[PDB]
Amino acid sequence: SFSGYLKLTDNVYIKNADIVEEAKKVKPTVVVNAANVYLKHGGGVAGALNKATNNAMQVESDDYIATNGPLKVGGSCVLSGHNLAKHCLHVVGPNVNKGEDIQLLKSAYENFNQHEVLLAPLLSAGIFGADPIHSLRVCVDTVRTNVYLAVFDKNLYDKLVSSFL
């Protein structure tokens, strides 16, 4: 199971880790992808997870979109975890570089409550342009299930921990 995490709350844990390497190691029931509405896994967490699946995540995703159309900002779908996890929960946080409403970050994190335990990134962080400190606050104030957060950047990990509360 999960090792090396700092406990932030009753249900939120955090680790300075590459979510791809964490998933490959742990192979959790659920890994969260920082998806976009098109499930186009080009960069950031999504590009990295998809590359680790040898593009099988993208091929599955393209079939999902062809069948169902795009997700909503704030929404999710459950697809295969391929080699990384049993399931991948593809969650769309707002991309504030695209002018999406930051208020939808809470809606995005509510999707986590449908799963008892998840490996996840901070939604809307990194290339999605939101303040990771805000993202962690919304995470702890929204998610009630057990969520293991992987933070790639060590300087940001240290900032998140040192400013928590």
Swiss-Prot record:
Record entry for activity regulation: Inhibited in vitro by GRL-0617.
Reactions catalysed: Thiol-dependent hydrolysis of ester, thioester, amide, peptide and isopeptide bonds formed by the C-terminal Gly of ubiquitin (a 76-residue protein attached to proteins as an intracellular targeting signal)
Record organism: Severe acute respiratory syndrome coronavirus 2 (2019-nCoV)
Subcellular location: Host endoplasmic reticulum membrane
Topology of the protein relative to the lipid bilayer: Multi-pass membrane protein
The protein's name in its UniProt record: Papain-like protease nsp3
Domain (Macro): residue spans on this chain: 1-165
Subunit record text: May form homohexamers. Interacts with N protein.
UniProt function note: Responsible for the cleavages located at the N-terminus of the replicase polyprotein. Participates together with nsp4 in the assembly of virally-induced cytoplasmic double-membrane vesicles necessary for viral replication. Antagonizes innate immune induction of type I interferon by blocking the phosphorylation, dimerization and subsequent nuclear translocation of host IRF3. Also prevents host NF-kappa-B signaling. In addition, PL-PRO possesses a deubiquitinating/deISGylating activity and processes both 'Lys-48'- and 'Lys-63'-linked polyubiquitin chains from cellular substrates.
